Curated annotation (Swiss-Prot), chain A:
Nucleotide-binding among keywords: no
Task performed by this protein: Component of the Mediator complex, a coactivator involved in the regulated transcription of nearly all RNA polymerase II-dependent genes. Mediator functions as a bridge to convey information from gene-specific regulatory proteins to the basal RNA polymerase II transcription machinery. Mediator is recruited to promoters by direct interactions with regulatory proteins and serves as a scaffold for the assembly of a functional preinitiation complex with RNA polymerase II and the general transcription factors.
Gene expressing this chain: med18
Gene Ontology molecular function: transcription coactivator activity; transcription coregulator activity
Protein name: Mediator of RNA polymerase II transcription subunit 18
Native species: Schizosaccharomyces pombe (strain 972 / ATCC 24843)
Curated annotation (Swiss-Prot), chain B:
Cysteine pairs bridged by disulfides in the record: none
Function (record text): Component of the Mediator complex, a coactivator involved in the regulated transcription of nearly all RNA polymerase II-dependent genes. Mediator functions as a bridge to convey information from gene-specific regulatory proteins to the basal RNA polymerase II transcription machinery. Mediator is recruited to promoters by direct interactions with regulatory proteins and serves as a scaffold for the assembly of a functional preinitiation complex with RNA polymerase II and the general transcription factors.
Family: Belongs to the Mediator complex subunit 8 family.
Range within the parent protein: 151 to 200 of 200
Source organism superkingdom: Eukaryota
Protein name stated in the entry: Mediator of RNA polymerase II transcription subunit 8
Subunit relationships: Component of the Mediator complex.
Compartments where located: Nucleus
UniProtKB/Swiss-Prot annotation, chain C:
Gene for this chain: med22
Matching PANTHER family: MEDIATOR OF RNA POLYMERASE II TRANSCRIPTION SUBUNIT 22
Family listed: Belongs to the Mediator complex subunit 22 family.
GO CC field: mediator complex; nucleus
Function: Component of the Mediator complex, a coactivator involved in the regulated transcription of nearly all RNA polymerase II-dependent genes. Mediator functions as a bridge to convey information from gene-specific regulatory proteins to the basal RNA polymerase II transcription machinery. Mediator is recruited to promoters by direct interactions with regulatory proteins and serves as a scaffold for the assembly of a functional preinitiation complex with RNA polymerase II and the general transcription factors.
Gene Ontology biological process terms from the UniProt entry: positive regulation of transcription initiation by RNA polymerase II; transcription initiation at RNA polymerase II promoter
InterPro entries for this protein: Med22 (IPR009332)
TM helices/strands, residue ranges: none
Organism encoding this protein: Schizosaccharomyces pombe (strain 972 / ATCC 24843) (Fission yeast)
The protein's name in its UniProt record: Mediator of RNA polymerase II transcription subunit 22
GO molecular function per UniProt: transcription coactivator activity
Self-association state and partner proteins as the record states: Component of the Mediator complex.
From Swiss-Prot, chain D:
Record's function text: Component of the Mediator complex, a coactivator involved in the regulated transcription of nearly all RNA polymerase II-dependent genes. Mediator functions as a bridge to convey information from gene-specific regulatory proteins to the basal RNA polymerase II transcription machinery. Mediator is recruited to promoters by direct interactions with regulatory proteins and serves as a scaffold for the assembly of a functional pre-initiation complex (PIC) with RNA polymerase II and the general transcription factors.
Subcellular location: Cytoplasm; Nucleus
GO molecular function: transcription coactivator activity
Encoding gene (name): med11
Keyword Repeat in annotation: no
Top-rank taxon: Eukaryota
UniProt KW keywords: Cytoplasm, Nucleus
Subcellular location, principal: cytoplasm
One Pfam family hit: Med11
Protein known as: Mediator of RNA polymerase II transcription subunit 11
Biological source species: Schizosaccharomyces pombe (strain 972 / ATCC 24843)
Length: 207, 34, 118, 98
């Protein structure tokens, strides 16, 4: 699954207007809250790719789940991602990276990363909104720091007093080999880009 | 009679630091580095 | 970028404005240059009349240009997004019960219902 | 100052413009019918403010048009599918039919 990401800084000074705008020109909003976790590989010698993206990223929707519970850490639904690097010297047109949406269901969840020998690493909470557009979808970011490690009790800690809202257009190609589907996708994202360039400044960014 | 704001130009500097701040936060999501 | 668009647009607006005002004031200002009478040749006077009328028309035209700007700005202030969806007649909030009894009755029309039971 | 209000402010500017004509024609009239240099000094002294205040008023209102950061291009509407008032409206009629 080759995702076609986009990025767009939103100053918080003007953020509400962007919301009132997008709500009147796009599907949704759908509420977004999620709790990332990264569990670190720790092996030597190379060749370990040991890349900053190579570190694994488990994901979990947490919004519907109530804040009071503390056993959410396993009882909650979970998933796993890789997200490889974007293809080199990719400008004008959106950057493109491989992504794999793994899922799993058992009482044993987190433990498995230790079963792979992986251990706890950096983590952060995301909050924002998603907007549908047929296949393509745009999600807006807020990377709140949890009040405690693996805790779901507000307030959560902002990186700074004025955290930018990180707009993120994307779509999920079923497979890279199909330049036809690539064409339809690049087309859809192009139309989205035109659709919201009037009040925002998206651009390709290397990853 | 009178006849015809750099601060508005400075707004671009605001966008600039906001952009570097975006680089910072993406580096965070990549690594957790602050 | 989002900024330079509004900026350059503002540049266009200011440009048209200063050009219109400068046009009016210039056309009026030169009439005084045309205002001289005595000492001129009889033929030389003639073009100057047409020059007067043309300067006047130029003035009134730039005046029209100003309103042409005003309509633009008005259009800009109405092209902005609504703060919220508009209120309507939310009055007489509909019942759920009658709808149920009607649907359930009609669906059970000419039917011998016999409770539920587990 | 918000939304429509600035437009209403523009309405205030609206009355001034046409008069700028006759006022100029008044000024000349002082050297014309009145044959008086001084009265011309007066109405010419008055006439320029009609220009200055309106010009600056436009430049400033436009500057407000930039400060408001209203986008240069009108947005393409989504096909809005279900605002709530439409919903409870149709529901209201539904009960009205029932």
């Amino acid at each position: 699954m080759q995702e076609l990401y986009l990025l767009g800084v939103v100053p918080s000074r003007r953020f509400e207007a962007v919301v009132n705008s997008l709500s009147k020109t796009l599907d949704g909003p759908k509420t977004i809250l999620e709790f990332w976790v990264v569990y670190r590989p720790k092996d030597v010698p190379p060749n370990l790719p040991r890349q900053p993206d190579s570190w694994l990223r488990l994901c979990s929707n947490i919004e519907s789940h109530d804040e009071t519970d503390t056993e959410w850490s396993k009882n909650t639904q979970w998933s796993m991602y890789l997200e490889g690097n974007s293809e080199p010297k990719r400008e004008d047109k959106c950057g493109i990276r491989p992504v794999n949406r793994a899922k799993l269901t058992n009482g044993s969840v987190t433990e498995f990363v230790e079963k792979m020998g992986y251990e706890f690493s950096h983590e952060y909470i995301i909050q924002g909104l998603e907007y549908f557009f047929f296949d393509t979808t745009v999600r807006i970011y807020q990377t709140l720091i949890p009040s405690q490690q693996r805790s779901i009790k507000p307030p959560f800690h902002p990186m700074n007093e004025e955290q930018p809202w990180i707009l993120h257009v994307y779509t999920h190609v079923a497979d890279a080999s199909n330049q036809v589907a690539m064409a339809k996708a690049e087309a859809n994202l192009t139309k989205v880009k035109t659709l919201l360039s009037a009040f925002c400044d998206l651009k390709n960014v290397r990853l | 009679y009178s006849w015809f704001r750099q601060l508005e130009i400075d707004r671009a500097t605001e966008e600039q630091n906001a952009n570097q701040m975006l680089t910072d936060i993406l580096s965070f999501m990549k690594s957790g580095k602050r | 970028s989002f900024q330079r668009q509004l900026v350059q647009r503002t540049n266009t607006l200011n440009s048209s404005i200063d050009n219109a005002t400068l046009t009016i004031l210039s056309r009026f200002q030169d009439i005084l240059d045309i205002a001289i009478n005595e000492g001129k040749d009889k033929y030389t006077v003639a073009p100057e009349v047409y020059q007067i009328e043309c300067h006047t028309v130029s003035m009134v035209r730039a005046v029209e240009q100003l309103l042409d700007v005003s309509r633009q700005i008005k259009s800009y202030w109405l092209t902005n997004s609504l703060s919220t969806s508009f209120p309507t007649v939310d009055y007489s909030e509909p019942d759920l019960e009658k709808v149920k009894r009607t649907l359930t009755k009609l669906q059970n029309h000419l039917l011998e219902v016999s409770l539920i039971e587990p | 100052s918000s939304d429509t209000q600035q437009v209403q402010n523009i309405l205030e500017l609206e009355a001034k413009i046409p008069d700028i004509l006759s006022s100029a024609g008044k000024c000349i009239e002082a050297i014309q019918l009145n044959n008086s240099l001084e009265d011309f000094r007066k109405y010419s002294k008055e006439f320029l403010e009609t220009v200055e205040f309106i010009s600056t008023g436009l430049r400033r209102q436009a500057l407000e048009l930039e400060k408001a950061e209203v986008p240069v291009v009108s947005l393409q509407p989504k096909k809005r599918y279900a605002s709530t008032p439409l919903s409870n409206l149709i529901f209201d009629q539904s009960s009205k039919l029932i």
